[PDB]
């Protein structure tokens, strides 16, 4: 069928290809799953910089009987890991923290520079001893580079996701996604730089809250297509 | 009296001018109305960019008996829109949907390059399949130049509108209003970019919830002053 | 002890000059007193430029009962203030503003330009008759300079303050605070604008509830090293 065939591959390049156009996203979902199996996914997209900030309260499990615990309430059990007894708890919130964070990356991302910062509970740079001298961001840990594992994205050639276990204690989280200008042109020099400033942080965020992980698979990542791998190394 | 009258007249020249000045503030007021009348405004303002980003779970009306529903609550809902059978309604959430979305734009506007994308319910490109690889900004639909409608500025020359109906489904928004400079002087060349991009995001925004639209105009529109337009087309 | 007394001081010059770094974040506490002597702190942290951005349903004390209560409750309140008769009140919220806004700035600020602007209770610049005409940024007064007052930052020489008494409304808060680049070298300047532009707004906010004063210090302030000036003139 030369040309119903062509006319299928034309299309498979263009959804392939899209996300090499200027204005078209990178993709970053990060999911944090907790110790019953619950996964809450967040979702940011931008064309030239991603950046996906989350606050630890914002990394808790939040819901309780149907219901969303509020920001005060996650911030009051944090505290306690932030600020020695800086709280009444008497057993710690192991069972809201996440067990392990999944970051998914996809489209025209430049690999050498996307950087995924785990930071403290209050947001300082992570450190056994954090303190508002020695807080930055950057840091040469977070560059992760071949450090990403390739996932197939079904003919990009654009997803690798990086993953990493926490032991119990809250995190913060601070990723940088940039674009790949390694075709040699900077979107940042001329006149397109008022274009490209414009365009940053335009996108709106998405935060889901899944029972399980089917359920993530399911109604997100094969809903949208983000190909993610589970804990017996299946693609989904 | 010549010069009561030139007061006056300075006065009112001093006011209506003033959004052309450097650092004056172009501003957005977003206005959700629902089906039983509730009006839901979201004010966003800056004097280079204004970036009125707005999640689905924020547009829907969140009110119940006088509480304000969760995010989860509200995500739980949008969340049958975007993934088939992904929650447990019986029955749509028509009732908490905008009918009708109001941008209301007022002060130096490029309005060539003044960008308002309706996206889809978890943030990506408007589409009749949504999915990662064909999610962009600033689509061409997006640029509403002359479909701007103009409204009374009282003086400034500065206010036009756009007005859109949704069809019962959840939307998320991305506006961009960027500065007029057909002046000819691009605010970003040179050392002055430094201080431009010191003022990108910068304006705490303000939501606002009333019963009616008369108390819309009564407590917002009338208070401030931005000029809205009803369903009979009388303006506010 | 010549060596090991060397090896202190060394190490007590890194921790002193850590902020200088590129990429080194300046560190911005707000805290909030109220009239029973609540303090809520907001953190804000960036090496280039700290947006400190809070609405005035933010600034109310949002504690009951053990409770947070939401911005739609918070912002009724505000209402009444902003809008005549806008709401259904017969008393005051004074109980639930701040009586007084502390400002604690950490780091390697170019002072000149830090810029504090306390904004009307709907985010518009401060004056007797707010309006959409005359909201701009960075107003005269904001620019404090030399009206910050010097705090201990332990060897940094690099710690300041301002305080601000409200006089019984609320109000919204806008801060800019701009890197020292003093040294001579422009960093927007040249291909490292990318590299800044990519750093800006990538560090969680944190925002705390204490009962007192005293747990402020013990479990904020000395825990991560920003000292704080009491009522009566004593650092923590
Ligand atoms: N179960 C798995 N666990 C870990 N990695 C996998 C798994 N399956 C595939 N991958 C990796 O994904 C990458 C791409 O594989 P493949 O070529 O099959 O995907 P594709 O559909 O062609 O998509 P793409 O266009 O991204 O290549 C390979 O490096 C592959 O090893
Ligand atoms: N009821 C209405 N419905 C729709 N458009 C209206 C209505 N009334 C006025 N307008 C439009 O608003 C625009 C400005 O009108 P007008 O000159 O009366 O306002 P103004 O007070 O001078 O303020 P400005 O300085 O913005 O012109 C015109 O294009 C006008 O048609
Ligand atoms: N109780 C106080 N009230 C107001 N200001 C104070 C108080 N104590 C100290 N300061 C001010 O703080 C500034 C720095 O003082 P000092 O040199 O003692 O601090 P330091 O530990 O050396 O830290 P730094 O490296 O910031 O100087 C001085 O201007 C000092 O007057
Ligand atoms: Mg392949
Ligand atoms: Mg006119
Ligand atoms: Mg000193």
Request: hydrophobic share 35%; net charge negative.
């Given at each position: 069928?030369?040309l119903?065939?062509?006319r299928?591959?034309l299309?498979?390049?263009?959804?392939?290809?899209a996300?090499?156009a200027?204005?078209?996203?990178?993709?970053?979902?990060?999911?944090?799953?907790?110790?019953?199996?619950?996964?809450?996914?967040?979702?940011?997209?931008?064309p030239?910089?991603?950046?996906?900030?989350?606050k630890?309260?914002?990394?808790?499990?939040?819901?309780?009987?149907?219901?969303?615990?509020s920001?005060?309430?996650?911030?009051?059990?944090?505290n306690?890991?932030?600020?020695?007894?800086?709280?009444?708890?008497?057993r710690?919130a192991?069972?809201?923290?996440?067990?392990?964070?999944?970051?998914?990356?996809?489209?025209?991302?430049?690999?050498?520079?996307?950087?995924?910062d785990?930071?403290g509970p209050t947001?300082?740079?992570?450190?056994?001893?954090?303190?508002?001298?020695?807080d930055?961001?950057?840091?040469?840990?977070?560059?992760?580079?071949?450090?990403?594992?390739?996932?197939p994205?079904?003919?990009?050639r654009?997803?690798?996701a990086?993953?990493?276990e926490?032991?119990?204690?809250?995190?913060?989280?601070?990723?940088?996604?940039?674009?790949?200008?390694?075709?040699?042109?900077?979107?940042?020099a001329?006149?397109?730089?008022?274009?490209?400033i414009?365009?940053?942080?335009?996108?709106?965020?998405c935060?889901?809250?899944?029972?399980?992980?089917?359920?993530?698979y399911?109604?997100?990542?094969?809903?949208?297509?983000?190909?993610?791998l589970?804990?017996?190394?299946?693609?989904?």
């Amino acid at each position: 069928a030369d040309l119903s065939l062509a006319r299928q591959r034309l299309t498979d390049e263009s959804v392939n290809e899209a996300p090499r156009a200027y204005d078209a996203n990178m993709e970053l979902v990060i999911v944090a799953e907790y110790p019953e199996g619950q996964c809450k996914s967040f979702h940011f997209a931008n064309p030239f910089v991603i950046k996906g900030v989350i606050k630890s309260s914002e990394l808790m499990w939040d819901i309780d009987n149907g219901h969303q615990m509020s920001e005060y309430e996650l911030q009051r059990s944090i505290n306690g890991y932030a600020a020695s007894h800086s709280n009444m708890r008497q057993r710690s919130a192991i069972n809201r923290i996440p067990k392990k964070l999944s970051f998914y990356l996809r489209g025209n991302v430049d690999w050498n520079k996307a950087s995924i910062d785990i930071r403290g509970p209050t947001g300082l740079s992570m450190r056994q001893t954090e303190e508002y001298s020695l807080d930055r961001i950057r840091p040469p840990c977070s560059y992760k580079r071949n450090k990403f594992v390739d996932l197939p994205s079904c003919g990009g050639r654009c997803e690798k996701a990086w993953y990493v276990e926490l032991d119990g204690r809250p995190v913060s989280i601070a990723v940088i996604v940039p674009r790949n200008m390694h075709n040699g042109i900077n979107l940042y020099a001329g006149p397109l730089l008022g274009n490209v400033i414009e365009g940053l942080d335009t996108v709106p965020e998405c935060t889901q809250w899944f029972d399980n992980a089917p359920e993530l698979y399911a109604y997100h990542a094969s809903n949208y297509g983000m190909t993610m791998l589970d804990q017996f190394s299946v693609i989904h």
